[PDB]
Amino acid sequence: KFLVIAGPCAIESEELLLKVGEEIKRLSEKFKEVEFVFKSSFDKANRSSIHSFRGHGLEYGVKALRKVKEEFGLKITTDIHESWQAEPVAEVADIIQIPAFLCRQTDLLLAAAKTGRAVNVKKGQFLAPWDTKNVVEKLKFGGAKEIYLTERGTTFGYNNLVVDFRSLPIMKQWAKVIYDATHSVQLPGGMREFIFPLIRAAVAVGCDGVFMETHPEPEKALSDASTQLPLSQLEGIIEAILEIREVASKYYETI
Amino acid sequence: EKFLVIAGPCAIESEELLLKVGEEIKRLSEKFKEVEFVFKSSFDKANRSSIHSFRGHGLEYGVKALRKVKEEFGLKITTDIHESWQAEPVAEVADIIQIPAFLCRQTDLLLAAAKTGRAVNVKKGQFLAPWDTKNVVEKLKFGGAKEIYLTERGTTFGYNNLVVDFRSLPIMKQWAKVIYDATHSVQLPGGLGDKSGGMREFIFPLIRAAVAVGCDGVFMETHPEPEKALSDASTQLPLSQLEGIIEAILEIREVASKYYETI
Amino acid sequence: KFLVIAGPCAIESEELLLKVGEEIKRLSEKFKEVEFVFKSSFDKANRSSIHSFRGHGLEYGVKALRKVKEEFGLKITTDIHESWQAEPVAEVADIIQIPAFLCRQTDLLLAAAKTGRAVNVKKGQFLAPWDTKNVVEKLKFGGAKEIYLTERGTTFGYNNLVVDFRSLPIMKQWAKVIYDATHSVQLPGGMREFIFPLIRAAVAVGCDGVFMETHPEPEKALSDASTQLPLSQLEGIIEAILEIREVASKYYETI
Amino acid sequence: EKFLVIAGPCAIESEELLLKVGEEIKRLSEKFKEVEFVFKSSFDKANRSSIHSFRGHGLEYGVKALRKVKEEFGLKITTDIHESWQAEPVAEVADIIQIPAFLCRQTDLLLAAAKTGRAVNVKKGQFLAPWDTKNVVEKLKFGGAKEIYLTERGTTFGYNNLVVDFRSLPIMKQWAKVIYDATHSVQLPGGLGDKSGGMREFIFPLIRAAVAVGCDGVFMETHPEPEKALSDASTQLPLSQLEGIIEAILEIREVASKYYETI
Numbered sequence A, C: 001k002f003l004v005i006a007g008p009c010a011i012e013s014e015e016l017l018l019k020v021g022e023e024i025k026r027l028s029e030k031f032k033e034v035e036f037v038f039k040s041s042f043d044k045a046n047r048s049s050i051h052s053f054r055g056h057g058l059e060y061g062v063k064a065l066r067k068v069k070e071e072f073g074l075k076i077t078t079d080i081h082e083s084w085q086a087e088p089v090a091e092v093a094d095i096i097q098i099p100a101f102l103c104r105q106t107d108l109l110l111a112a113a114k115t116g117r118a119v120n121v122k123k124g125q126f127l128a129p130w131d132t133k134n135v136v137e138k139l140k141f142g143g144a145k146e147i148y149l150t151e152r153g154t155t156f157g158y159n160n161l162v163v164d165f166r167s168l169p170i171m172k173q174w175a176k177v178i179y180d181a182t183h184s185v186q187l188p189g190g191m192r193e194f195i196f197p198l199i200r201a202a203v204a205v206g207c208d209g210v211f212m213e214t215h216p217e218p219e220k221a222l223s224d225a226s227t228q229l230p231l232s233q234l235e236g237i238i239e240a241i242l243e244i245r246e247v248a249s250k251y252y253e254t255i
Numbered sequence B, D: 001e002k003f004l005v006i007a008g009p010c011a012i013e014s015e016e017l018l019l020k021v022g023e024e025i026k027r028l029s030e031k032f033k034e035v036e037f038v039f040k041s042s043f044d045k046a047n048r049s050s051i052h053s054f055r056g057h058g059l060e061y062g063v064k065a066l067r068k069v070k071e072e073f074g075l076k077i078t079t080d081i082h083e084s085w086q087a088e089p090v091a092e093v094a095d096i097i098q099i100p101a102f103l104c105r106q107t108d109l110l111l112a113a114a115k116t117g118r119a120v121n122v123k124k125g126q127f128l129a130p131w132d133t134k135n136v137v138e139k140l141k142f143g144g145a146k147e148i149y150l151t152e153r154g155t156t157f158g159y160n161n162l163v164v165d166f167r168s169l170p171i172m173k174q175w176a177k178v179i180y181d182a183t184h185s186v187q188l189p190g191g192l193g194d195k196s197g198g199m200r201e202f203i204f205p206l207i208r209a210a211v212a213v214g215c216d217g218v219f220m221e222t223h224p225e226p227e228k229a230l231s232d233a234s235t236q237l238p239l240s241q242l243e244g245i246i247e248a249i250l251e252i253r254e255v256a257s258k259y260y261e262t263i
């Protein structure tokens, strides 16, 4: 079924995770056709500034994510940054996420694949759509069986990303495809007004799921504040993409 | 508002070709009454990569052929001009004067089109940023144009490749009606060396994206037998596929429409 | 011999052309090894704004350019924008320039070639280096024998141009190559600090000449004010590129 | 200031390969006394496109081989790390710890390198703008790095292609010493599908441009027989050509030097 990966960018506190987790649980009950996966990073290991927020550590993070899964029965997903983190994270994460800058780091991919969990790789901003075939092969070699590739924009000049929707059908040849609606519009080192329009395009073109960072009060978020979707708008967007998908799916090309 | 579908053979290979395509477009205009069809075909391909490529049979022949299409089918007409002097003669038959992408910044060409009183559709140059079309529209308004369209046809992305930045649709909508060019956006500039390439497999998915995001019309080149086309043989849509594509975009437009943002 | 195309961007007045023409004449006498060509546009036909400066017309322009050639004995070059302008412009222009946005307009190229004059085509920001082979072929077909291709940057994301120096050796396979030092650093719809550094790169790589817009008081220029080189700095830069060329030429690759 | 030339085989195919290249680099260091040579070779290619490509013989073997080069020739050493734990063991032999381009934003890796007390050279990511390296240097300084280098190795330009924006040299010079990577800048990422491509014919012209613009050093991978290399066979410079290239860049640097702008 259609996948919806959502949650606050960073684990600012399990308190925050619970609030967002409650709303995602609610939507989960309203849209039984959709498979929801709660997402939040225990560490923002690639911030531009040394003075920016990273998180409260892996242990506190994994603990908070456990609280969400136990309290709401929602599947979990978080990203790893070094090989050693794969095992401990797999304890709670149903889907292990591979950062875009790290999509070519063989040992990280293998470490993730070895856990037995599903692996979602953010397509690097430097990668061409067809270059992801090799990424999937690394994971299959590592024992991975449920593999996802996420479209999150491609480097377009300086401090800008463009979404080449031709990537969706191309990547679909070797993996399930997820569209990252929030990072695709950010301006490296974004514009919220483009989030909805592009997510509509993604489902019209055809994908297997969408990824969206959401926060009760984006303006106060400690990470990606300019692009996180306000929690209150999540239901509306999900219903919208389901209706568009329903009509458009008739025309999705085979493989 | 009425959705615009601009379609026809890339080049006026012959008046016969035009009438064959026109017949089908007329049939579709009778079916899709919520669509305003405009028949398109260039009397001259003034910017081919190679000097040996097909250009056309001249302005005179071209206007005559287009007039026949309008006369026989009652279809609105659009064609592109390449130099200022062509605006006057073309305006006699063209309901919409089209400005080529490479020439979207040539002030006199824009002014020549604007003063004819006809609608003007400017292809956004592959070098232009979305927000920079504001001045293009300003020039047209300054020149007297009352109905203006901006067409998204891709942006230079590395060499011999174009990418469609759909953020351009809501941006350009701020100052003009927006049209999505479904066939030129997937072409590979200078791809085959002496000629440009293209990937037909992406025409349909990208047009679905265009209407989901929201535009005021689509532009599609269509030919009975693309493989035999004298220009853009790699991107022209088979004529038999036109009807299905249009129905599909009207369906996606309808369901997405309630979510189109207000500019 | 090494070509140096220089002059004010636009013909703001023949008065201005004479002042700049006097300095170019002087340098012409100081650097006998270099072939100087005076440049200035009679019309800026592609300004972004309808309210910007275009010029005083073709007649006034061609007249002013005549005054420079007659008074200083300097070769001339200006750009054309429509086919009909080729003939009248050829009366004074030794080199007919084809605008970057118009490098694929067949009739403009043919019209220029028909005049018998040399033709310099600005490589479009949308063109790949190898795509210029076809441009040269159009000119040869039109009777052109002295053909130049000018590097002026390539579209790199929005409102930015990058100079891919790989273009110099590539374009050299079918035409003499000129490097446009002033338009290559401008930001479409620039940065003067990069003019000298990149012109040094151009000669180190290897080219047949350089193109530089110069004005006595750039800040007051009616066109490309942010990138026009101050007249007083022209001599220094020319001497610099000659010294670099002298040493580097030993390593220029054959064809 | 003394010009830096970082050179060596892309990967530590064998200790034998290292000694053969090291011998030549040592010979050149005796000739070009105004140059500070640093021998480079990766103990692991941790980011190959294909799982079937050569990676290396492990950290242990690698450090041992590099130590032999430093021991036999008295040459400074540099190699790249891929995860934080590798900084400590590598620092035992590496005079300069190199940070891979894809990892230029991984805070812990940068910090791990900085605290070793060794110099740190960061390859500018293909996704990074020149002005955004300011924060990269800030992180290193924060972590205790006292000698920092930023290496220009090209920027993503469309798919499977990189372009070198030489404006990056004077920009990055504002906060660190700048190195130009003459061999990676001409490679075509994922060019051959399972592996990356490259155009050797552009290595020399672009390095001439680098020194004309002005940098503090150059980085060049060299191999006795590039065609047999287990990594970057399309871009590694034949070892016999190294001497000529270095003489040429020193000559161009000298004549251009008086014109280098003051940051």
Ligand SMILES: O=P(O)(O)OC[C@@H](O)[C@@H](O)[C@H](O)CO
Residues within 6 Å of the ligand: B045, B047, B048, B049, B050, B053, B101, B184, B187, B189, B190, B194, B195, B196, B197, B231, B232
């Ligand atoms: O095939 P070549 O001659 O490159 O021409 C490209 C065509 O696709 C051309 O007529 C196009 O739309 C013009 O810009």
Ligand SMILES: O=P(O)(O)OC[C@@H](O)[C@@H](O)[C@H](O)CO
Residues within 6 Å of the ligand: D045, D047, D048, D049, D050, D053, D101, D184, D187, D189, D190, D194, D195, D196, D197, D231, D232
């Ligand atoms: O040949 P593939 O495996 O693509 O690897 C690219 C190499 O050029 C690679 O080791 C490179 O410099 C790493 O980024």
